[PDB]
């Protein structure tokens, strides 16, 4: 009875096996744009992805994920609210059954069709496992997806999805450039939070970009053809793999922009 997104194993059940689900620093959250405070002390974010080395793409039964070579400082996130250097290790997405839902974060209660998470770890802790347990160990760059014009830099991803339809399947996925997934503006909101799946560790500095990327209907429809189930199990489409907004509690969301 492993965690998932169904009626019997979804977000409202997670606290039983991961009690921090009811913690003080859980993610995602609703971003109230009129309560978020502009912080003139914040730096421009530095997203340095030119030397990224993608390795493989996997369906893990909860999303699909592209792993990167993080054995040296190839693709890093710096600046903004961060102190030190954060190495890109993986990206994945959350998405909906319909275009009107799918994001984890919301903006003035608005849901987007999907949300991209670029996951980074603080190099001062040496490896991602150790970093994941530290209060300033991880930084997730979150990017909203809306449906409209196609995103050309996403097409290589959606064309490989037919090869990883079911849980446990992986494929080679070298030479993918994550710069092709970024919007024009790096304006962002930031707040201290958590992983949005089990184990829900409260170890993430969230950086959520204000500007969504557009993807086509055809692109997001291909996400929805993935399966939660393994090969030779009854088919259950991988859709609505998002955690709802959690209580903000004693946190302030800061804006990088006026
Ligand atoms: N359940 C796991 N395999 N997850 C794990 N340890 N990966 C850690 C992990 C990384 C990022 C995110 S997210 N959605 O906040 O960006 C969730 C979980
Ligand atoms: Zn995520």
Author numbering: 3 to 260
What do the authors report?
Carbonic anhydrases (CAs) are a family of zinc metalloenzymes that catalyze the reversible hydration of carbon dioxide to bicarbonate ions and protons. Among the human (h)CAs, the membrane-bound isoforms IX and XII are recognized as significant solid tumor markers being overexpressed in various cancer cell lines mainly induced by hypoxia regulating factors (i.e. HIFs), and in the case of XII also by additional effectors. Here, we report a small series of dual-targeting compounds that combine the prototypical carbonic anhydrase (CA) zinc-binding sulfonamide moiety with the biguanide group of metformin, an emerging anticancer drug. The binding modes of representative inhibitors 5b and 5c within the active site of the hCA isoforms II and XII-mimic were assessed by X-ray crystallography, thus allowing us to clarify molecular features that may be useful for the design of more specific and potent inhibitors.
CA XII-mimic is an engineered CA II with a modified sequence constructed to mimic the CAXII active site. We determined the X-ray crystallographic structures of hCA II and hCA XII-mimic in the complex with inhibitor 5b. The inhibitor presents the classical binding mode of the sulfonamide moiety in the active site of the two isoforms by directly interacting with the zinc ion and forming hydrogen bonds with Thr199/198 (numbering of hCA II and hCA XII, respectively). On the other hand, different hydrogen bonds and water bridge interactions are established within the active site of the two enzymes, resulting in two different orientations of the inhibitor tail. In contrast, in the hCAXII–5b complex, the inhibitor interacts with the amino acid residues in the opposite region of the protein cavity. Indeed, the nitrogen atoms of the biguanide group establish water bridges with Thr199 and His64. By analyzing the mutations in the active site of hCAXII-mimic with respect to the hCA II isoform, we realized that the Asn67Lys variation in the hCA XII-mimic amino acid sequence is the only one that could influence the binding mode of the inhibitor. Lysine is more flexible and bulkier than asparagine, which may induce a different organization of the inhibitor within the enzyme cavity due to steric hindrance. The inhibitor tail in hCA II forms a water bridge with Asn67, whereas in hCA XII-mimic it is oriented in the opposite direction of Lys67. Noteworthily, the Asn67Lys mutation in the hCA XII-mimic was found to be mainly responsible for driving 5b toward the tumor associated isoform over the cytosolic hCA II.
